[PDB]
């Protein structure tokens, strides 16, 4: 299977206070499993899935200190970028950092990531070759030059090809029962009058893992409709996901429309239509 380990890091400078708000969330696939928050009563690296609670206190001690060390680096980097851009201290800015590895079914590395954004726009990113960088303006050009001079690429490449892959393998073994599973969706269509001559048909998918899913609607014999109301796939809160797709159809011609549901846990799609009570 395709599997990924990713860490999402956000630092938010505070005008008036000196220490920024620092958040790290860790994900295997779509399942979050660790968290660090600056603004906790005692800022520690904490479990967010029960299967990571299989790690001894040395794991939690190393990860807490490294999270804490990262926060001190992200405080400095935020100060560096304040000067690069000639900005003032009485306004808030953010530095975001995503990194981690996609591994394939054989368990070999497919893509590694190490990318950052300032104020939510691309800043610097590590290229797919894991050896060169892409910058986006004058300021990231300086950062890129700094990083070329200290061979930052080979330090990140080392992480992504080694520990990221090996740690991902360990987590997939600790959380095998919940991470290496496919829960197919359960699906139905609901019916809601929208006007006099019209009706809203909504195709529900519920209770599925992983998160990736596709819903299509079509008028039978016609190509798929792009004219469609979608919601973002959303978490149920229990580890599964939900989604719906809606379409507005003429009163009386409901049964001429068909929903399809595609998911990794479905050898064939589900095929649903409105079924009157």
């Amino acid at each position: 299977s395709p599997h990924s380990l990713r860490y999402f890091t956000t630092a938010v400078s505070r005008p008036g206070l000196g220490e920024p708000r620092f958040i790290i969330v860790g994900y295997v696939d779509d399942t979050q499993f660790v968290r660090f928050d600056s603004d906790a009563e005692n800022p520690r690296m904490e479990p967010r899935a029960r299967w990571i609670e299989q790690e001894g206190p040395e794991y939690w001690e190393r990860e807490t200190w490294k999270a804490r060390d990262m926060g001190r680096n992200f405080r400095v980097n935020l100060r560096t970028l304040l000067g690069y851009y000639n900005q003032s201290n009485d306004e808030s800015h953010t530095l975001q950092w995503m990194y981690g590895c996609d591994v394939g079914p054989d368990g070999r590395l497919l893509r590694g990531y190490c990318q950052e954004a300032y104020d939510g726009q691309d800043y610097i990113s590590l290229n797919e070759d894991l050896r060169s960088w892409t910058a986006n303006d004058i300021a990231s050009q300086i950062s890129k030059h700094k990083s070329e001079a200290v061979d930052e690429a080979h330090q990140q490449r080392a992480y992504l090809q080694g520990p990221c892959v090996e740690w991902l393998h360990r987590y997939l073994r600790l959380g095998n029962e919940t991470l290496q599973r496919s829960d197919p969706p359960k699906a139905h269509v609901t019916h809601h009058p929208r006007s006099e001559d019209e009706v809203t048909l909504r195709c529900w998918a519920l209770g599925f893992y992983p998160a990736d899913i596709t819903l299509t609607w079509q008028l039978n014999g016609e190509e798929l409709t792009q004219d469609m109301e979608l919601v973002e796939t959303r978490p149920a809160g229990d580890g599964t996901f939900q989604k719906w797709a809606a379409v507005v159809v003429p009163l009386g011609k409901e049964q001429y429309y068909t929903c399809h549901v595609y998911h990794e846990g479905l050898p064939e799609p589900l095929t649903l239509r409105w079924e009157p009570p």
């Binding site: 990194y99 610097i124 990140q156 992480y159």
Partner: peptide, 9 residues
């Protein structure tokens, strides 16, 4: 487990 280094910007 987290990376050891972040780039110095």
């Amino acid at each position: 487990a987290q990376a050891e280094r972040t780039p110095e910007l």
